[PDB]
């Protein structure tokens, strides 16, 4: 999927998690976010096509997705323990990853 | 100074930036936070007291300070350009760095 569709998936499912109140709902939404983040994890974005793959800017951009995926994974483990509210709080903290990357590279 | 000292310094001065009576207080606070972050990077957090310097948890702990310092430096450049409102806006987003590392290790 393209970058815009992946970002919409991340956007909407964050709210699905906030609206949820059980572990299955939160796990399902986090799983969709994980797939969306991985889909976008490798491609050079438009403001960065004039940069090497190992350039500091590309490195930080790719790190942004790797780290987002890591914390999605951590929230999933919470949901898989039935820790609904802790998983929701972890999901809310994902917004930091969103805004950090956007401020750098959007 | 120890890790508790550094964290008090980070907490007090982040609040100074939020409440600064004048623009000059923002730069002075950022300067103190930068020093505190680099000092904290050389500590071992209680929850990782077991781990050797080479452990994956200690790597991510140290890295969070490098990344915090990078964004402090971004905010300092803004302040040194006279863009003091932009610098205060950037400093507010430093809270995400606090929250992220704490989620792992506080
Ligand atoms: C970089 C490592 C990013 C992370 C982490 C997140 N996003 Fe993102 N986002 C990124 C880019 C480069 C862009 C712009 C792409 C372009 O070509 O313009 C975006 C855009 C969005 C959007 C706007 C969608 C649109 O139709 O234009 C949204 C709504 C969005 N991103 C949401 C979002 C969320 C919720 C994230 C965290 C959970 C998130 N993004 C992370 C780069 C990066
Ligand atoms: C890791 C990379 C961290 C970053 C970035 C920040 N903090 Fe932190 N903080 C961290 C740890 C491992 C701990 C526990 C230390 C301990 O001895 O238990 C803390 C703790 C704090 C505290 C409580 C301190 C105390 O005396 O118990 C505060 C008030 C605090 N941290 C504030 C703080 C702020 C405001 C930060 C961003 C500017 C910040 N920390 C970043 C690890 C990390
Ligand atoms: Ni992390
Ligand atoms: Ni950054």
In this structure, which residue's CA is closest to atom 41 in ligand 1?
A: A98
The Cα B98–Cα B106 span in angstroms is 10
Residue A100: list chain B partners with CB under 8 A.
93, 96
The Cα B1–Cα B43 span in angstroms is 10
Given a contact cutoff of 8 angstroms between Cβ atoms, the answer to whether A52 and A21 are in contact is no
Structure tokens at B51: 């781990």
The region, left, alpha or beta by phi > 0 then psi within -120 to 50, assigned to residue B2 is beta
The region, left, alpha or beta by phi > 0 then psi within -120 to 50, assigned to residue A20 is beta
The Cα B88–Cα B71 span in angstroms is 12
Given a contact cutoff of 8 angstroms between Cβ atoms, the answer to whether A105 and A47 are in contact is yes
Q: 3-state DSSP helix/strand/coil percent for chain A, to nearest 5?
A: 75, 0, 25
DSSP states of B26-56 as a string? HHHHHHHHHHHHHHHTTS--GGGTT--TTSH
The Cα A75–Cα A83 span in angstroms is 9
Experimental approach was X-ray
User: Does any CB of chain A come closer than 8 Å to the CB of residue B93?
Assistant: yes
User: Does any CB of chain B come closer than 8 Å to the CB of residue A96?
Assistant: yes
Given a contact cutoff of 8 angstroms between Cβ atoms, the answer to whether B67 and B47 are in contact is no
User: Does any CB of chain B come closer than 8 Å to the CB of residue A10?
Assistant: no
Q: Shortest Cα distance from A65 to chain B (angstroms)? A: 15
Q: What is the resolution of this structure in A?
A: 1.7
Provide the terminal-to-terminal Cα distance of chain B, rounded to the nearest Å.
18
**Can you tell me which residue has the tokens 């709080």?**
A89
The Cα A46–Cα A103 span in angstroms is 14
In chain B, the number of structural domains is 1
3-state DSSP call for residue A82? coil
DSSP states of A13-46 as a string? HHHHHHH--SHHHHHHHHHHHHHHHHHTSSSPPG
DSSP states of B7-31 as a string? HHHHHHHHHHHHH-SSHHHHHHHHH
Dihedral sign from CA coordinates of A95, A97, A100, A106: negative
Whole-Å CA distances, A58 to A32, A49, B77: 25, 9, 22
Element at B41 (helix H, strand E): none
Pairs of residues, one from chain A and one from chain B, whose beta carbons lie less than 8 Å apart:
13
Residue B51: domain span: 1-106
Please compute, for residue B7, the number of CA atoms within 13 A of its CA located in the half-sphere on the CB side: 13
């Amino acid at each position: 999927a393209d970058l815009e569709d992946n970002m919409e998936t991340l956007n909407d499912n964050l709210k699905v998690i906030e609206k949820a109140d059980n572990a299955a709902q939160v796990k399902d939404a986090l799983t969709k976010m994980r797939a969306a983040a991985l889909d976008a994890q490798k491609a050079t974005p438009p403001k960065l096509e004039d940069k090497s793959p190992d350039s500091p800017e590309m490195w930080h951009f790719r790190h942004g997705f790797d780290h987002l995926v890591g914390h999605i994974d951590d929230a999933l483990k919470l949901a898989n323990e039935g820790k609904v509210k802790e998983a929701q709080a972890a999901a809310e903290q994902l917004k930091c990853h969103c805004n950090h990357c956007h401020q750098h590279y959007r």
